[PDB]
Design a protein around this ligand. Structure first.
Ligand SMILES: *C/C=C1\C(=C\c2[nH]c(/C=C3[NH+]=C(/C=C4\NC(=O)C(C=C)=C4C)C(C)=C\3CCC(=O)O)c(CCC(=O)O)c2C)NC(=O)[C@H]1C
Ligand SMILES: *C/C=C1\C(=C\c2[nH]c(/C=C3[NH+]=C(/C=C4\NC(=O)C(C=C)=C4C)C(C)=C\3CCC(=O)O)c(CCC(=O)O)c2C)NC(=O)[C@H]1C
Lengths: 495, 495
C-alpha cells in the first residue's frame, strides 16, 4: 500500500548505524546524510542570530573563504543585502518546504536558496548564469490535451526540449506503490522504459513520503563523492541536520548504485502531487554528468504544479465518460427493478444486460430461497460452495481480480470465475459478477517485486521481464465498483 | 444558481440586435463584438491557406501596412518564420483555448499570440519589450500559506507587487453566483472593497461561462473607443467572428460604463478554476489607463493556475479539521445509538450533546408515536404543525437558513426556529435541528440583488450598503449536512 507511514529509520552511518542492504533499505535515514553534492555549497546558520554553525568542506570553492573562517560569522555580515529579506520571506515557525531564492554577484553569479528547519536556517549556493515562450505554450498545450496519455506525452516532450535530458519519463504510481512509465521522451537508440512497470521497492516508502513534501530532487553526478558538513552534527542539538529541503542533499548510496547500474550519469525528478498524495514523477535521465541550472529547474517545478493540476482534470474526464454510460445503465436497471415481482427473471432479462454492465462473463443471482445463473459460471456444487464462502465473508461488497488470493479452494474456479464482484442485500440474497481467467503478461523493468529481495544490493537487470500471471482476470474498473455499491443501495431499498 | 447554462444571446448591434439594458444584459453576445481594443492589432486568416480574411482598422499602426493591402495576402508570406510553427502548435480541431505565443522583430518587438477557432486563425499583435525570483518565491509562499485567507492575502500582495495595480482583489464566488472580496491589496487612501459582497448580475452568466474557458481578460482603457474589424463578418460564413479567445476583444459597453462608474481607468482579471467550475477571480483595478505587458500577464496566468491548485488544497484542509471533529462526534453518537432501547432518552442525553453537534439551539426528536424536544423550541402546537409540514415534504433531508422561505406559516417561528435541519428515517420518525434568528448585516458593494434591476444602466453607487436581513439564522455548514446524511444512514440501519 502507498497510503502508509514510513518505517522508523536507523541512525545514520556516521552515528554508528547499520549497513544498508535490500533487507532494511526502507529504514535508511536519507534525509540526514550529513553531506551534500559537490556542485554547490551549503551553510547552516542560527535562525535568530544568523551565526554560521555548519559548513560544507567545499565551501571555499564557491564562497572564496575557508570553512573555519566563515564559521562563527553572522549572515548579517556576509549577506547584508539579503539577511533582512531572508528573515522576512521565512518567518519563524514556517514550513520547512518554504523556499526563498535570490541571485548574488561575486568574483560569477551565485544562486542562493534558503529555507528554515526548526531553529536552523539552511542556505544553498549554486553557480548560475531557456526558450522565450516555451513555458507558456507548454502550459496551454498541457491544458488542451484530450486525455491523460496525450498530457503525459506533451509533458515529457516539453521537459526534454527544455532540458536536453537523454531520457524523460512520466512515472505513474499505483495504489500498491508500484509505478509505470506512461510516457517517454528519449534520444534515438536509447533503451525504452515506456510501458514497463517497476516494483515499489525501487522507490522506498520514506523516499515517496519525502517526495510528497519536497517536490524536486536530483543527482548531478552518479560517480561524484559527497561533501560532508563540518561539523556534521548541528551544534544547537548535537544532532543530525535535516537536509530533506535541500536540493544539494547527498543522494542515498543505494539509489546511486542503482543509477550507475541503470547506466545513468545524471538523474532528476519532480513530484506530481494530487490531493496530498504522490501521484507520480517526472523522471529524468542523462547518460553523462549534468548539472541543471537553477532557473531551468524552476521551470521544471512550474511544470510540476501545472501537471499536478491537469492530471486531476484529465483523469476526472476519463472517469466522467465511462461513469456516465455506467450511470445510464444503472438508470435502466433501477427502472426495471422498481416494478419487479420476480427478481431472478427481471435481473436475468437479456434486455437489461447485467453482464455487459460490468463486462463480466458470468453472473450468479441469489434470491428468495434459490439461485440462478447467467453466462459462464462454475458447476452447481462450486456455486453453492462459493455462496457459502460469501456467507463466511464479513463485508457488504467483495471485489477481486483473482479469487485464488481470497479463496484458496476456489482457485480451481479460475476458468469461469477468476475475477469476482459480489454484493449482498442484507448474505441471504445477493448478486455476483464473474470474469474468466485471462492470459496476462506484465512487462516489468528487470525484476518482479519477489525478485528484488534476492540481491543484497540493487539489481543490474532492467530489460523487459514478461511475468505471465495466472489465476487473474480483467481488473475491475473502480467505476464499476461504485456502480456495484449504488446497485446495492438501490436494490436494498427497492426489493 | 451558478451551475447553469447561459441564456440564448441576441444578435449583435451591427446585425440589427436590440439595445442592451439591465433587463436583457444576460443576453448580450459579448464574445462577438466585431471589434478590438486600440492598444493592439488583430488578424483573422483562413486555417488552411493562411489567407488574411479580416483585419482591424488600426492594423496599419502596428504592422506598417494598410488593411486593404494585407487583405488577401497569406501568412506564409507575411510570417514565413512563424507560419509553419504556427500550424504545428495549433493542429486542426484543437480547442479554441489553445494559444501559441512568439516574439517578432519589426521596425520595436511585437508579441504575437495565435489561436484557432473552427476554420479560422486568430492572430493578436501587441507591443512588447519583472522581478528575478518573484514568481518562484510567490509559488512557495502560496503553497506554505496556513489557510485560505492567508493564501488570498499572499496572492493579492504578490500580484500587486508584480503589476503595480492600484487595487488587487481575490473575488470568491458563492453557489448563488454572488461573490465576495476576501483579500485586497491597494494603494493608500483608495477605497476598500474588502469584506463586501456583490450581486450575481455584476458578472452575468455568459461572462462567467466565458471566463471558465478563457482564463484572462482586461480593459486597458475604459474610455477608449473600440476598433472594428474589416470586414466585420467572417467571409467564410458571412457570420460574426468568435473573439472569446482574443485578449484584445472589445469589452462589453455595459461593463465599460460600470468600470467608469466605479472610477476605474484600467481593469484586468484572471479566472481561478477548480474542478471545471469558476471558483473566483483575481480582479485588478487601476485608476488610470494601463496596458499590462504580455509577459507580466503570462506571470499572472501562472499565478492563476497555482492559485487554482492551492485553493483546492487549503479548502480541503479547512474542511478536513472541522469534519474530523464532526466525525468523532458521529462515532460517539453512533456508538451510543447502537445499544439504545429508548431512542428519545438516548438522543436527549446531555452527554451525547446532539445540540452541540450542529451548534443548534433547538432539537425535536420524533420516535414511536410521540415527540420530545431539547433546548429552545417553538410551542407544542407549532411543533405538531412543523411535523405536519415535514410530512408534506417530499425529500429525505431538509435544510434551510431561513424557514420563512420554505414555510410561510412558520415564519413566525423564527425566534427559536429560523434555521432548520431535518432528517427522516423512513417521515413517521425523524430528527430536527433548529437555529434561532440572528441579527445579520450583509455588507453589499453599493446594491442588493433586488436593487440592481431598478436602474436601466449600471449603478453609480459602490459604497457599503448594510442590508439587515431578518428571519435568518447561522448558515448551515456543508460538513454539518454531510454529518446529517451520515446520521440518517446510521440511525436508519441501527434502529
Ligand atoms: C530499498 C532499496 C532500493 C532503492 C532505494 C532508493 N531509491 C531512491 C530514489 C529513486 N528511485 C527511483 C526509481 C526509478 N528510477 C527510474 O528511472 C525508474 C523507472 C525507469 C524507477 C522506478 C527514482 C526515480 C528515485 C528518485 C530520485 C531520482 O529521480 O533520481 C532512494 C532515495 C534517494 C534520495 O534522494 O536520497 C532510495 C533510498 N532503490 C531500489 O531499486 C531498491 C534496491
Ligand atoms: C448584466 C449587466 C451588468 C454587467 C455586465 C457585465 N459585466 C462584465 C464583466 C465583469 N464584471 C465584473 C464585476 C466586478 N468588478 C469588480 O471590481 C467587482 C468587485 C469589487 C465586481 C463584482 C468583473 C470583475 C468583470 C470581469 C472583467 C474585468 O476584470 O474587468 C461583463 C463582461 C465583459 C467582457 O469581458 O466582455 C458584462 C457584460 N455588469 C453589471 O454590473 C450589470 C449592470
Amino acid at each position: 500500500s502507498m497510503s502508509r507511514d514510513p518505517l522508523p529509520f536507523f541512525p545514520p552511518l556516521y552515528l554508528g548505524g547499520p549497513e544498508i542492504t535490500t533487507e532494511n533499505c526502507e529504514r535508511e535515514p536519507i534525509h540526514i546524510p550529513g553531506s551534500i553534492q559537490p556542485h554547490g555549497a551549503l551553510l547552516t546558520a542560527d535562525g535568530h542570530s544568523g551565526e554560521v554553525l555548519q559548513m560544507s568542506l567545499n565551501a571555499a570553492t564557491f564562497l572564496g573563504q575557508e570553512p573555519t573562517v566563515l564559521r562563527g560569522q553572522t549572515l548579517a555580515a556576509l549577506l547584508p543585502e539579503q539577511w533582512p529579506a531572508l528573515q522576512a520571506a521565512l518567518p519563524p515557525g514556517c514550513p520547512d518546504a518554504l523556499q526563498y531564492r535570490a541571485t548574488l554577484d561575486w568574483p560569477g553569479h551565485l544562486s542562493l536558496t534558503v529555507h528554515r528547519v526548526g531553529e536552523l536556517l539552511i542556505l544553498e549556493f549554486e553557480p548560475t548564469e531557456t526558450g522565450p515562450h516555451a513555458l507558456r505554450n507548454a502550459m496551454f498545450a498541457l491544458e488542451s490535451a484530450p486525455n491523460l496519455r496525450a498530457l503525459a506525452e506533451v509533458a515529457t516532450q516539453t521537459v526534454r526540449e527544455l532540458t536536453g535530458f537523454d531520457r524523460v519519463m512520466l512515472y505513474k504510481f499505483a495504489p500498491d506503490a508500484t509505478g509505470e512509465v506512461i510516457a517517454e521522451a528519449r534520444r534515438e537508440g536509447l533503451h525504452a522504459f515506456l510501458g514497463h512497470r517497476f516494483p515499489a521497492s525501487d522507490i522506498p516508502a520514506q523516499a515517496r513520503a519525502l517526495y510528497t513534501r519536497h517536490l524536486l530532487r536530483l543527482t548531478a553526478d552518479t560517480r561524484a563523492a559527497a561533501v560532508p558538513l563540518d561539523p556534521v552534527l548541528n551544534p544547537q542539538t548535537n544532532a543530525p541536520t535535516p537536509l530533506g529541503g535541500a536540493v544539494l542533499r547527498a543522494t542515498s548510496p543505494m539509489h546511486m548504485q542503482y543509477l550507475r547500474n541503470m547506466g545513468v550519469g545524471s538523474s532528476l525528478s519532480v513530484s506530481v502531487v494530487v490531493g496530498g498524495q504522490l501521484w507520480g514523477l517526472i523522471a529524468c535521465h542523462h547518460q553523462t554528468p549534468y548539472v541543471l541550472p537553477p532557473d531551468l529547474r524552476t521551470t521544471l517545478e512550474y511544470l510540476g504544479r501545472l501537471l499536478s493540476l491537469q492530471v486531476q482534470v484529465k483523469e476526472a474526464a476519463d472517469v466522467a465518460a465511462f461513469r456516465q454510460s455506467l450511470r445510464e445503465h444503472h438508470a435502466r436497471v433501477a427502472l426495471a427493478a422498481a416494478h419487479s415481482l420476480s427478481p431472478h427473471d427481471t435481473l436475468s432479462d437479456p434486455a437489461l444486460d447485467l453482464l455487459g454492465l460490468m463486462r463480466a462473463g458470468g453472473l450468479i443471482l441469489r434470491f428468495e430461497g434459490r439461485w440462478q445463473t447467467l453466462g459462464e459460471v462454475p458447476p452447481a456444487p462450486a456455486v453453492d460452495a462459493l455462496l457459502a464462502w460469501l456467507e463466511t465473508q464479513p463485508g457488504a461488497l467483495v471485489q477481486t481480480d483473482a479469487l485464488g488470493q481470497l479463496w484458496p479452494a476456489g482457485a480451481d474456479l479460475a476458468p469461469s470465475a477468476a475475477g469476482l464482484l459480489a454484493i449482498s442485500v442484507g448474505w441471504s440474497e445477493c448478486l455476483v459478477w464473474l470474469r474468466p481467467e485471462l492470459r496476462l503478461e506484465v512487462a516489468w523493468g528487470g525484476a518482479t517485486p519477489d525478485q528484488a529481495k534476492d540481491d543484497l544490493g540493487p539489481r543490474h537487470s532492467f530489460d523487459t521481464y514478461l511475468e505471465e500471471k495466472r489465476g487473474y482476470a480483467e481488473p475491475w474498473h473502480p467505476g464499476e465498483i461504485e456502480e456495484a455499491q449504488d446497485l446495492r443501495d438501490t436494490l436494498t431499498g427497492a426489493l
